[PDB]
Curated annotation (Swiss-Prot), chains A, B, C, D:
This is N-succinylamino acid racemase. Changing residue 57 to C: No change in activity. Keywords: Isomerase, Lyase, Magnesium, Metal-binding. The active site is at 155 (proton donor), 254 (proton acceptor). Binds 1 divalent metal cation per subunit. It comes from Deinococcus radiodurans (strain ATCC 13939 / DSM 20539 / JCM 16871 / CCUG 27074 / LMG 4051 / NBRC 15346 / NCIMB 9279 / VKM B-1422 / R1). The lineage of its organism: Bacteria, Thermotogati, Deinococcota, Deinococci, Deinococcales. Its cofactor is a divalent metal cation. Acts as a N-succinylamino acid racemase (NSAR) that catalyzes the racemization of N-succinyl-L-phenylglycine and N-succinyl-D/L-phenylalanine. Can catalyze the racemization of a broad range of N-acylamino acids, including N-acetyl-D/L-methionine, N-acetyl-D/L-phenylalanine, N-acetyl-L-glutamine, N-acetyl-L-tryptophan, N-acetyl-L-leucine, N-formyl-D-methionine, N-formyl-D-norleucine, N-carbamoyl-D-methionine and N-carbamoyl-D-norleucine. Also converts 2-succinyl-6-hydroxy-2,4-cyclohexadiene-1-carboxylate (SHCHC) to 2-succinylbenzoate (OSB). Inhibited by salicyl hydroxamate, an inhibitor of o-succinylbenzoate synthase. Belongs to the mandelate racemase/muconate lactonizing enzyme family. MenC type 2 subfamily. It catalyses: N-acetyl-D-methionine = N-acetyl-L-methionine; N-acetyl-D-phenylalanine = N-acetyl-L-phenylalanine; N-acetyl-L-glutamine = N-acetyl-D-glutamine; N-acetyl-L-tryptophan = N-acetyl-D-tryptophan. Signal peptide: none annotated.
Length: 360, 360, 360, 360
C-alpha cells in the first residue's frame, strides 16, 4: 500500500574525524517506520555549488511542507511532488533517498534489492592524496595493494603526474590504477597528460572544468587514456550527453550529486546502454551515506571498484550501530530492510549541533 | 524478502477473435502466490523472428530448468540466472515478466508502483487498418475520435498514404495522428513520404526494414515528420544506438519485444535521457499481456498514447475476470497486487489447446 | 587610484508590486563613497539554482570576510579575491557589481563609460505573459506598440504558441517580435515550433531545459527561427560553447546570472566575435539593479532591445530618487558617477525586513 | 567627465640600435595632459601589410581630422569615430592607444588597471635567432636560462629545426621552450615538424602563411605539438575563428597588429573563453610601445611569458625617461598614470627625422 509522511527531523551533527565533518541528516517518519539520509553539501561551495545553509532552508521552507502529510505510491512520486525547482540536487537527494529508505522499510526489503541489484558484496578501491615523492607514493600503494583494495586512485596535479604514475606502474604492472586530475589541468596540458597513456590507466578523472563536457571531449581526442567524468555529470541526460560527445568513457557516479537513487539508476542504465561502466564515488559520508552507497553499488554496471572503503578509516566512531568494514577489498551489503543500518541516537545526541522537527 | 520458484505451467490457449489468436501463458508458483505472463511470439515469424515452437522449447528445455527450485532476491536475479543465450527476447520476457508479477504479489504491491510509475490512468489511441477509400477512412476514424481515443494510427502503403492522411487531416485538423508504414518503403520513397510532412503527423512508424537503424537515420534527414521505431529497438542499447544515430525521435516500446519490464524501464529511461518520448505498443494481448502493458505505461516518459485500448474491441470473452476498458482515451490502472488481474480458470480451460507442468 | 573596502551592509527590502518581490541589497563603503548592488536570486530556486538564504550566507560567511579591510586596484581584483568557490554566480555578482559602482564613484566616471559603452540611450522592449485568447493577446500587444516599445516578447506554451504569434503577427507585420518558450518543450515539439518560422520572429528564447546547450543545438538545426539562450549561459565560456555548438544565434545576457559586469562585458565580447547579438535581460529589478543593467546596455553588441522598461510599470514607489522611464522604446542613461542613481534611504527604511553591517 | 582632443603631433624618430629603427610617434593633447603611442608599421611591408608612408598619410589626412576638436567619453568612442575605414589596424592603433593613455591620464589611473589587469610584475621570455650549430644554440640558451628568462623561443627554418630543438631539450629537459617557424614551411613539411613532438614544445609559431587559418588547422591535425598564431590573428573574430577551427591553441597577441587595447582585451577574452592562453608579442618597440605592452600584459590570460624584454637589450638610449629593465625574467609595471612612462623630449629632438602639429 501507499506511505504517508507524518514528520521529519533535520539533525546536523559534527562528527570527529580521525577536525570535524558537519553531517546533515534528514529523517522521514511514517507507517511506524523511518527513513534516513545524509546531505553531501558542504558549508561552503567547494566540491560543487550547493551549500548547507542553502539546502537546509530549501528543505525546511520548501521540500518538507510539500511532502509532509501527503500520501505517496513510491519514492518517485515523492521526487515528482517537488519537481518544479531548479538545481539543488543534493538537497533533493536528502528527501528522495530517505523516501527510498522509508519505502523499502514499509515493505521489509533491502534497498539494493528494490533498485534491482543482487550482489552480496561490492568491490572497493582507495584514493591516495599527493605524497612527497615517488617512493612515498609507491610505499603507500604497496600497503593498500596488500590490504587487497581492488583499484588504486592517485591524486595528481600539474608538475606531479607522470612521476607518481610511472613509479607506481613500475612497481605494480598489473593493478587497476586510476588518477584524479581534480579539475587542475587545461587543454594546453594535453601533451603532458598524453604521457600517461603508456602506463595503461583505467582512466583520468575530471581533468578539466567541473561543469564541462565539450572540452573534455576535445581532450579525449588528443590522448588515448580514457576520461572519467565526476562533477560534470549531475543527471541521466548529462550522462547521455557526455557519452555521446566522447567526453569520457567512465563515470564516477555519486548518488546525491545526481539527485538520488532513481536518477542514479538512470545514469547507471544510460551508461550501461553505451557499454560504459560506472563506479560509486565517495563524499566522506557517515554510516548513513556509506550504506546508501553500498546498496546502490549492488547494481550490475558498477563494474569498477567504488570509493566506499571502511568507515573505521574516517571516524573513530560512526553515527550508526553497525560497522561498515571492508575486508580484502570487498564490502558486504549490510543486511536488513532499507539501508540495513540504524542510527545510534544516543551517540548522535552527543554530537548534534542542531535538530528540529517538522509536521504538517 | 527472497522468493523460491517451485513450479511452472505453460498453458497455451486459443482465443477466438471478435478466426483466432494463440495465447501462450507462463505461470510461476512460489511463496503461496503466482505470477502470470503471456507470450507475444506467433506460430510463424511475421511480426519478428521468434516462433511459438522455438520459444516453448527454449522455456521447457533451458530457462525453466535454470530457475525451478532456485531462490531469488528480485526479477533481475531471475533474468541474470537464464544465461548468455542469444536473442529470443520474447521467450525471456515470459519468464522475466511472470517473475515481476510473482515478486510483486509476494510484496502485495502493484507492479507499476515497483517499476517507478505513479499514474492512476494512462492515455490510449487505436490503430486502423487500410480503408477502401478516403471517405471510408474518415468514417472509421470518426467512430474512434467519437470514442475519445487520444491518437489515431493509420496503416499505410504505396500508393495509399497521402490520401487517407489528407482526408483524415482535413476532417480532423486537431487530432493526434500517426501512421504505420509497415516496413513497406525504401529510401526511394522519401519524396513520397515527405509529402506527409504538411499534415502534422506526430510520426511515421518504421517505414524501412524491420531490423534497420542506419537507413532510417538517412531517411530522417530527408523528411520533417519524426520517425518512430518499433521492430528495430529490441533493447536499451539498440535504443541508445537508434537515438545517437538519429534513426528516430520516438520509440514504440513493446515490453516483450525488449525482453521484459526491467529492460523496458531501461529503454524508457534511455529515450527520456535523449528527450525522446516512448509509447506502449500492443500485440493483440489477452488481459494478462494487456495488464502488464498498462502497468508499465505508468512510467513518466510514456508521453504519447499507447496502442492499449479495450479488451472488448478484440474478444467476446477475455481470459481474466477483470474488465480492461478505456473511457475517453484513458485506461485505468487495474487495482490489486502485481498486474491486478486474475485468470478466469474455468473459462481458460474451455479454450486451452495444451498444458504442461514443470517442477524441480 | 587604489580603493579600500571598509564596511558592507546587507539590506533586504520587501517591495510591493503595483503581492511582493524581495530585494537583497549590498552596499560597499570605501574612500568616502559607496557602491550599491541588488541580488537577483529568489527566496526559492524558480528561475535558477541560487536562493536568498544561500547567497546571503555566502556573502556574510565567505565573500565579505575575504574583502573587508582589503585594498584593491579594480573590480577585477575584487573578484579575483573571492577564491575558487563553485557556481553561486549571482552571489558573486552582488559583490562584483557593488565594487564596480564603488570603483567608478571614486573616479567620478559613469559605470557604462568604464565598461566601454558610449551610447547615450538604449532601446527597450517588454515581455507579455499569456493572454486568454488571440484578441486579448493583440489588445495587450497594441497598448505596448502604442507606447513605442521596440520589441514585443510573448510568453508561450504547448498548445498556446502559433495562435498568439499568428494573431499578433497579422495585426503587426512589421514589429520586432520574439517569444519566450519558458523551457516548456522538447525535441518532440520541433515540428510544432517550426510552424512559428513563417511569422518572422527574431527568436525563440530557451525552449528546452534551462541548463541545456546540446539539445538546443539539435533543435536549431530543425527550425529556421533563431534560438536565443538565457538560463543556459552563465559565463563567457558557456557562451563560447553555446555558439560553437550552434545552440543559439542570440543570447539574453543577464549581468548577475553571469557573475557581473566584467564577465558580462566578456560574454558580450564573445558573442560579438561570433557575430551573435546580445540583449540585456531583466529580473524585475528595483532601480539599483535596473540602473546597473542600463549602464551595461551601452556596449555596442547590445543590438537587440533589452527587457529593461519603466520603473513605474512594476512599482508605485521605487527604492531610488531618480525616475527610470523609457519614452518611445528608448531608455536614457541615468547621469552621474557609477550607476547614476541614489538610494532613497527614508523610503527604503519603511520597506526593510532585515539589515546587518560587516566590518574588518 | 569627457575628454576633448585639442592637438596632435606626429613625430618620426630614427633611434640607434645596439643600424637604426624608424620610430613613428603620435602624441594626443587634451585636458592639460597628453597620451602617446608608437607605430609598429615598417617603411616596407615585411612583417605585415601596412607601411609608414601609408599609415602617416591616413593619420594626418583622415584620422586626426576625424577626432581633432571632438569630445569623447572613452577610447572606444574614439575608435568608433574612425570606424568606416578598412584594414590599417596598426595606424588605427596609434590613435586608439594614445587615446587610452590620454584617457587614463585624465583620470590619474595606470593603463593596465583601466583595462582590468592587476599584476605588478609580468613574466618575460627571450627570442633567439638562428645560430650556426647545435652547441652555439645551447650555449646561448644556457646564458638566457641563467639570466632567468621564463620561456625560450628559437627561430627555426627548414633544414634547421629538429637539431637546435633536440640539442636544447637535451640540455634543458624542463624549460618552457617554443619555436618561431616564421611562415617558412608548407604542409609537405608535416612529417618533419611532427619530429618536434617528442621534445614537448609549448608551441610552434605561425609555421604556414601569414594570413592563413584553414591550412594551419589541417597542419594541427597532423602533428601533436600545439600551433601558435601570430600574423594571422588581427582581430577578436580572427581569434574566435582560429580557435574554433583548431588552427592553433595559443595566440601571440600584438596590441597594435589587432587595432589597440580594446580589441586586444577582446582577443584576450575570446581566447580565455576557449581556455587558450595568449602572450604579449614584441616589435622592437621603444619605451613608448614597450610600456603599452607591459600594461596590456597584466591581464590574466597572458599566462605565457611575453616578448617584452629589457630595453637596454635594444637601444643604447631609450626615448623615455624611465628604464624598462627585466630582472630574473620579471618586468615590473612602470608606476604612474596611463603608461607610467614619459618622453625625454630633448633626447627625442636629437633623433627626430620629422615632426608636425595638427589642430582642429
Amino acid at each position: 500500500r501507499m506511505f504517508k509522511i507524518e514528520a521529519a527531523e533535520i539533525v546536523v551533527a559534527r562528527l570527529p574525524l580521525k577536525t570535524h565533518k558537519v553531517v546533515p541528516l534528514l529523517i522521514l517518519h511514517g507507517e511506524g517506520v523511518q527513513g534516513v539520509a545524509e546531505g553531501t553539501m558542504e558549508a561552503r561551495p567547494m566540491y560543487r555549488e550547493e551549500t548547507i545553509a542553502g539546502a537546509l532552508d530549501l528543505l525546511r521552507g520548501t521540500f518538507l511542507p510539500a511532502i509532509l502529510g501527503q500520501t505517496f505510491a513510491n519514492p518517485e512520486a515523492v521526487s515528482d511532488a517537488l519537481g518544479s525547482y531548479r538545481g539543488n540536487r543534493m538537497a533533493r537527494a536528502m528527501v528522495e533517498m530517505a523516501a527510498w529508505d522509508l519505502w523499502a522499510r514499509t515493505l521489509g526489503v533491502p534497498l539494493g534489492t528494490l533498485l534491482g541489484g543482487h550482489k552480496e558484496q561490492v568491490e572497493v578501491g582507495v584514493s591516495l592524496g599527493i605524497q612527497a615523492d615517488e617512493q612515498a607514493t609507491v610505499d603507500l600503494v604497496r600497503r593498500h595493494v596488500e590490504q587487497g583494495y581492488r583499484r588504486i586512485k592517485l591524486k595528481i596535479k600539474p608538475g606531479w603526474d607522470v612521476q607518481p604514475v610511472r613509479a607506481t606502474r613500475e612497481a605494480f604492472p598489473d593493478i587497476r590504477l586510476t588518477v584524479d586530475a581534480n579539475s587542475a589541468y587545461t587543454l594546453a596540458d594535453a601533451g603532458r597528460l598524453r604521457q600517461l597513456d603508456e602506463y595503461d590507466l583505467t582512466c583520468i578523472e575530471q581533468p578539466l572544468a567541473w561543469d564541462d563536457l565539450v572540452d573534455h571531449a576535445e581532450l579525449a581526442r588528443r590522448i588515448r587514456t580514457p576520461l572519467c567524468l565526476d562533477e560534470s555529470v549531475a543527471s541521466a541526460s548529462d550522462a547521455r550527453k557526455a557519452l555521446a560527445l566522447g567526453a569520457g568513457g567512465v563515470i564516477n557516479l555519486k548518488v546525491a550529486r545526481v539527485g538520488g537513487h532513481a536518477e542514479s539508476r538512470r545514469v547507471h542504465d544510460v551508461a550501461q546502454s553505451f557499454g560504459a561502466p560506472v563506479w560509486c564515488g565517495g563524499m566522506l559520508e557517515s554510516g548513513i551515506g556509506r550504506a546508501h552507497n553500498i546498496h546502490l553499488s549492488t547494481l550490475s554496471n558498477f563494474r569498477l571498484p567504488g570509493d566506499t572503503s571502511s568507515a573505521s578509516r574516517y571516524w573513530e566512531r560512526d553515527l550508526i550501530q553497525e560497522p561498515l568494514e571492508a575486508v580484502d577489498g570487498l564490502m558486504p551489503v549490510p543486511q536488513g530492510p532499507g539501508t540495513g543500518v540504524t542510527l545510534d541516537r544516543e551517540f548522535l545526541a552527543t554530537v548534534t549541533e542542531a535538530q528540529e522537527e517538522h509536521r504538517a
